[PDB]
Amino acid sequence: LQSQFFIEHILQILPHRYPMLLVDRITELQANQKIVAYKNITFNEDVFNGHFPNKPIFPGVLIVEGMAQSGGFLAFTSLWGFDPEIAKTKIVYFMTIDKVKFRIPVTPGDRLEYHLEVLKHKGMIWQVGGTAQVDGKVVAEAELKAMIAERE
Amino acid sequence: SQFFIEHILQILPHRYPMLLVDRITELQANQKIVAYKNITFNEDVFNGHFPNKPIFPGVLIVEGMAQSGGFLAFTSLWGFDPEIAKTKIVYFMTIDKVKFRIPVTPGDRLEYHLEVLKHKGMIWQVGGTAQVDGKVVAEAELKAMIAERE
Amino acid sequence: QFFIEHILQILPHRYPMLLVDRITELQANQKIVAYKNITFNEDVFNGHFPNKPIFPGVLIVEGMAQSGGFLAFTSLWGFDPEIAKTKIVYFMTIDKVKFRIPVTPGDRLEYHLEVLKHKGMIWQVGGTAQVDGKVVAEAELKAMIAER
Amino acid sequence: LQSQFFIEHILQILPHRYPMLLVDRITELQANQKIVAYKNITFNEDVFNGHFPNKPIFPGVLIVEGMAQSGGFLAFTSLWGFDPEIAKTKIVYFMTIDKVKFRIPVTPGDRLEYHLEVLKHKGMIWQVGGTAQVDGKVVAEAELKAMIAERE
Amino acid sequence: QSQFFIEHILQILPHRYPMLLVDRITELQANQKIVAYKNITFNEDVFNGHFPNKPIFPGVLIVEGMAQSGGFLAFTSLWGFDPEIAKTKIVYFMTIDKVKFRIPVTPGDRLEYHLEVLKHKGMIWQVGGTAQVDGKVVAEAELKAMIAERE
Amino acid sequence: LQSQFFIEHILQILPHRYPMLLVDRITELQANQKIVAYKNITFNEDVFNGHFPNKPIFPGVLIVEGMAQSGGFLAFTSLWGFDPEIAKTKIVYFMTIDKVKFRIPVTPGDRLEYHLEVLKHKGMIWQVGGTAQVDGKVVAEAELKAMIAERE
Ligand SMILES: O=C(N/N=C/c1cc(Br)c(O)c(Br)c1O)c1ccc(Br)cc1
Ligand SMILES: O=C(N/N=C/c1cc(Br)c(O)c(Br)c1O)c1ccc(Br)cc1
Ligand SMILES: [Cl-]
Ligand SMILES: [Cl-]
Ligand SMILES: [Cl-]
Ligand SMILES: [Cl-]
Ligand SMILES: [Cl-]
Ligand SMILES: [Cl-]
């Protein structure tokens, strides 16, 4: 299992697609422990047409979504390694989200870095927590519990 | 205390594709609000969440609850005032106790039920659930702060 | 009932031209009742019209045609995704359509279509579109199922 | 009143906008009588993503919409002439549609020419009828009645 | 053949919405020249931002269309209309030169691409020509691409 | 005239809007001499739906467009400084493009950096040339001449 993955790999693991695949690259990955990934934020994203006009702010809820996707990748690969065939049969679902705090607004030009760590894991149930960072500063923090379920 | 999309457009700064509230069916100042957003396949989000399996994003359910709550907080203090609405912004500070129980899909009428847990000055804490056909599909607590635009 | 997943297996239409979200009633060679939710979160509203969201009358008719199309597919071969994935549908005629009430975000656009006449791949249906029990539009149309 | 109008002029008269402004140019226009205009059809249009996958067919209902918009432009300029200030607060409602027949499918690379004639008009209520053509051939026939109304 | 419609173009070029900028091919002569075109309608997303109240088809996209026309010519020159083989190839465009824009392109225009092979050595194809609207040269450019095995 | 401009400033100067505003932030600016800016590349961009499926690659022509917009931002501010009022009355026209080379493909997660210098400028006509860089490496080269014109 490698520690760096690019968009082509992320595409083979996550079921998410435009306009909901919110992770561009993974820089650090340690099975059952943590992951560090990021998503570039550009004005050239449909979301900014409505959030907000003349005032582009990346939706906080999407920051959270990005962290979860990161956690989901971590969870899956921790269990099956880089296995596209199986990834294609599994799907990660949000069970809970807690202690979410937005400290700094994210805007075009920003590199939204996700820092998630495994707080608890047993089988398909994974609890992760971490922060979203921009230039080393915590722009947000959150905790979530995910479920690795069947796609059917 | 019915508001339709046109009224909503004059209060919330959110526009497509991030205005997630279609109508407000109930509103009690400083107490509660009930609103909803219809879920149809004809939404761009479904192209990627997920292909061959449309599921309205859980985070977007929370966003819709937030928008409803912000609408509740705003109108409670200033009522239906478009002019003042442009000079104020309601952004969220925290979100907690979020739980997803049932997946929302095209055909569902996503109803938001938020009540004021407490408020002090420009800091308001709302909480409640998201419902479809009378069942709780999600629940969450959010804290917002009303500030001057600019 | 047939949900979006089932509708996707029969109708060839896709985003942003799949305008039926669910099938509530189906009676082979007789009628069909289905609907589509109308939400502000639809790209059409950016241009119809700015500052005044009104669901296009022609799209209401399209939604009725699709509903009729689903009735035609199933009446012809039942719920068969395999043969369905090879056909498409062409509009042939549209007649006697009247719009009485504008459809907007928050509305539940319900399609009520019955078979007027049909032969082979050519189906002619007619009915109304309703929002909360009231008729918002009436129409008759004939479409043809074809091998793509 | 001119007889040739370009997209810029159309934008100043019709309230429609992307993705529902289906008229690119007006080639000839006779007040209270007829109008000839057209819309280019290209693969680079969002509708084609779903109508249909691997087989781009310009939706029949949108052809009708295009003719209605052509009629709408004719209706407005016949009423107030070319006046953008009056135009910016008017919208247009479809009232009825009749005797439409589609003969030939329209596809990317086609120049959809609208030919509408005024059958009857009274105040804001205009009833036009005509055809849509491609390379001199009739691909559609349609009769419609639309109402111009002040936004309120 | 000499005339390919959108159906055929789709089976040869990997490009898809919103980057497939060639609607039909009216002329094709293996190893020599290609004449094709793309209609320009207001109903295109690019016009939402280029520019508000002033729809001007982007000059770089005219070049892209020409490039796509060159790529179809090159490919068809090597294997003809072969969808199966098309799936295993890619045409990397290495350079662009001598491009000049003479007349803006707008909704309602039939952008016609006129390209010819200027040189072909190995996997390298140098193409050049013009973009026309109603008989008038609207733009011109030279492009060089490399044929390679897709991956 | 400062040297760092964020998206809010770019929005008030350049007439480009979604989905054609391909410059997110200005990092260095020397009036009439040079500019360094960038655009973040994310998978969450509509253009990637078609360029190409299962293989996101930021279009070479769009990189040139990005360099042109950076040039346009330099040209305008050199001429009128930060003046939103006057910026509203202009648009930018591409006149020529030359010597462009595409050395390295640009993909999601990349920070596309634009480096442009003024080769010549006379009135509204500006000739700029430079490179596009990702992590200090030259990804593309180009020379172009644009013109700032009245919206009329
Ligand atoms: O500024 C924020 N949100 N929205 C701000 C905003 C919206 C509009 Br519309 C506007 O015109 C302006 Br002036 C704003 O600051 C924000 C600021 C800080 C954090 Br923490 C989260 C959100
Ligand atoms: O980087 C690429 N550039 N161009 C590919 C391409 C393929 C064909 Br056949 C063609 O005619 C052209 Br014009 C192309 O640009 C490329 C690489 C991978 C994939 Br999938 C598709 C395209
Ligand atoms: Cl936010
Ligand atoms: Cl979800
Ligand atoms: Cl209508
Ligand atoms: Cl059709
Ligand atoms: Cl240009
Ligand atoms: Cl490219």
mmCIF file of N, CA, C and O in Angstrom, chain D residues 1 4 10 15 18 24 26 29 40 49 58 62 65 72 74 77 90 106 111 117 119-120 124 128 138 150-152, unseen atoms left out:
data_model
loop_
_atom_site.group_PDB
_atom_site.id
_atom_site.type_symbol
_atom_site.label_atom_id
_atom_site.label_comp_id
_atom_site.label_asym_id
_atom_site.label_seq_id
_atom_site.Cartn_x
_atom_site.Cartn_y
_atom_site.Cartn_z
ATOM 1 N N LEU D 1 -38.182 50.175 -37.350
ATOM 2 C CA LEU D 1 -37.905 48.790 -36.853
ATOM 3 C C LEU D 1 -37.106 48.021 -37.903
ATOM 4 O O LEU D 1 -37.485 47.980 -39.074
ATOM 5 N N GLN D 4 -33.291 42.570 -39.352
ATOM 6 C CA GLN D 4 -32.233 41.643 -38.966
ATOM 7 C C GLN D 4 -31.809 41.968 -37.526
ATOM 8 O O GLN D 4 -31.468 43.116 -37.212
ATOM 9 N N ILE D 10 -31.574 40.243 -29.259
ATOM 10 C CA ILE D 10 -32.493 39.264 -28.709
ATOM 11 C C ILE D 10 -32.452 39.287 -27.177
ATOM 12 O O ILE D 10 -33.491 39.195 -26.520
ATOM 13 N N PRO D 15 -37.007 37.746 -22.269
ATOM 14 C CA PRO D 15 -36.609 37.566 -20.870
ATOM 15 C C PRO D 15 -35.841 36.262 -20.643
ATOM 16 O O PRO D 15 -35.168 36.109 -19.626
ATOM 17 N N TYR D 18 -29.919 31.539 -20.425
ATOM 18 C CA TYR D 18 -29.377 30.187 -20.428
ATOM 19 C C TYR D 18 -29.929 29.401 -19.244
ATOM 20 O O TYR D 18 -29.983 29.907 -18.132
ATOM 21 N N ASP D 24 -30.983 32.276 -31.768
ATOM 22 C CA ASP D 24 -29.689 32.922 -31.933
ATOM 23 C C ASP D 24 -29.682 34.150 -32.834
ATOM 24 O O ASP D 24 -28.876 35.055 -32.636
ATOM 25 N N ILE D 26 -32.296 36.710 -35.796
ATOM 26 C CA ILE D 26 -33.548 36.976 -36.515
ATOM 27 C C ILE D 26 -33.127 37.401 -37.917
ATOM 28 O O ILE D 26 -32.400 38.381 -38.066
ATOM 29 N N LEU D 29 -38.136 40.147 -40.286
ATOM 30 C CA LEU D 29 -39.253 40.384 -39.385
ATOM 31 C C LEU D 29 -40.217 41.443 -39.907
ATOM 32 O O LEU D 29 -39.817 42.560 -40.217
ATOM 33 N N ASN D 40 -28.698 27.726 -33.870
ATOM 34 C CA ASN D 40 -27.742 26.714 -34.286
ATOM 35 C C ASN D 40 -27.817 25.562 -33.292
ATOM 36 O O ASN D 40 -28.019 25.778 -32.095
ATOM 37 N N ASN D 49 -26.588 15.714 -23.109
ATOM 38 C CA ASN D 49 -26.081 14.762 -22.135
ATOM 39 C C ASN D 49 -27.159 13.733 -21.831
ATOM 40 O O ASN D 49 -26.857 12.581 -21.544
ATOM 41 N N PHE D 58 -32.115 16.774 -30.723
ATOM 42 C CA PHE D 58 -32.615 18.004 -30.101
ATOM 43 C C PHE D 58 -34.085 17.758 -29.760
ATOM 44 O O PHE D 58 -34.888 17.464 -30.638
ATOM 45 N N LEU D 62 -38.388 21.441 -27.258
ATOM 46 C CA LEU D 62 -37.540 22.626 -27.267
ATOM 47 C C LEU D 62 -37.614 23.318 -28.617
ATOM 48 O O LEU D 62 -37.329 24.509 -28.721
ATOM 49 N N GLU D 65 -40.546 25.393 -28.217
ATOM 50 C CA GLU D 65 -40.154 26.510 -27.370
ATOM 51 C C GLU D 65 -39.443 27.576 -28.199
ATOM 52 O O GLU D 65 -39.668 28.770 -28.007
ATOM 53 N N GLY D 72 -42.574 35.349 -29.652
ATOM 54 C CA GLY D 72 -42.526 36.307 -28.563
ATOM 55 C C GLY D 72 -41.802 37.576 -28.955
ATOM 56 O O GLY D 72 -42.234 38.675 -28.614
ATOM 57 N N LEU D 74 -41.466 38.698 -31.968
ATOM 58 C CA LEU D 74 -42.314 39.346 -32.962
ATOM 59 C C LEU D 74 -43.429 40.105 -32.250
ATOM 60 O O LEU D 74 -43.734 41.250 -32.578
ATOM 61 N N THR D 77 -41.877 43.420 -30.244
ATOM 62 C CA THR D 77 -41.457 44.519 -31.099
ATOM 63 C C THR D 77 -42.611 45.121 -31.902
ATOM 64 O O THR D 77 -42.552 46.281 -32.312
ATOM 65 N N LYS D 90 -40.913 42.299 -18.605
ATOM 66 C CA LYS D 90 -41.978 41.460 -19.159
ATOM 67 C C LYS D 90 -41.530 39.997 -19.196
ATOM 68 O O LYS D 90 -40.350 39.697 -19.392
ATOM 69 N N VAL D 106 -33.956 16.503 -35.387
ATOM 70 C CA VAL D 106 -32.958 17.566 -35.463
ATOM 71 C C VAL D 106 -31.723 17.127 -34.669
ATOM 72 O O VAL D 106 -31.842 16.623 -33.552
ATOM 73 N N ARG D 111 -29.066 23.749 -38.572
ATOM 74 C CA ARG D 111 -29.410 25.158 -38.408
ATOM 75 C C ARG D 111 -30.941 25.158 -38.358
ATOM 76 O O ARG D 111 -31.602 25.098 -39.390
ATOM 77 N N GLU D 117 -45.920 32.866 -38.322
ATOM 78 C CA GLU D 117 -46.828 33.857 -38.871
ATOM 79 C C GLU D 117 -47.916 34.109 -37.843
ATOM 80 O O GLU D 117 -48.328 33.195 -37.132
ATOM 81 N N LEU D 119 -51.415 34.394 -36.618
ATOM 82 C CA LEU D 119 -52.734 33.915 -37.011
ATOM 83 C C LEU D 119 -53.806 34.822 -36.418
ATOM 84 O O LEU D 119 -54.851 35.055 -37.023
ATOM 85 N N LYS D 120 -53.534 35.329 -35.222
ATOM 86 C CA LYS D 120 -54.473 36.189 -34.519
ATOM 87 C C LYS D 120 -53.797 36.745 -33.272
ATOM 88 O O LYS D 120 -53.071 36.035 -32.572
ATOM 89 N N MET D 124 -52.037 41.488 -25.433
ATOM 90 C CA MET D 124 -50.864 40.697 -25.071
ATOM 91 C C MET D 124 -50.949 39.255 -25.556
ATOM 92 O O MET D 124 -49.957 38.525 -25.533
ATOM 93 N N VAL D 128 -49.584 32.429 -32.878
ATOM 94 C CA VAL D 128 -48.775 32.253 -34.068
ATOM 95 C C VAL D 128 -48.758 30.804 -34.512
ATOM 96 O O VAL D 128 -49.103 29.900 -33.753
ATOM 97 N N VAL D 138 -39.005 20.995 -43.990
ATOM 98 C CA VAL D 138 -39.806 21.129 -42.780
ATOM 99 C C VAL D 138 -39.586 19.967 -41.822
ATOM 100 O O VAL D 138 -39.886 18.820 -42.140
ATOM 101 N N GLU D 150 -46.455 41.655 -17.671
ATOM 102 C CA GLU D 150 -45.582 42.445 -16.813
ATOM 103 C C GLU D 150 -45.261 41.603 -15.580
ATOM 104 O O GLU D 150 -46.155 41.033 -14.963
ATOM 105 N N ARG D 151 -43.980 41.509 -15.223
ATOM 106 C CA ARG D 151 -43.593 40.729 -14.053
ATOM 107 C C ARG D 151 -44.152 41.413 -12.817
ATOM 108 O O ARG D 151 -44.039 42.634 -12.658
ATOM 109 N N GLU D 152 -44.777 40.640 -11.941
ATOM 110 C CA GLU D 152 -45.293 41.230 -10.724
ATOM 111 C C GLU D 152 -45.038 40.313 -9.547
#
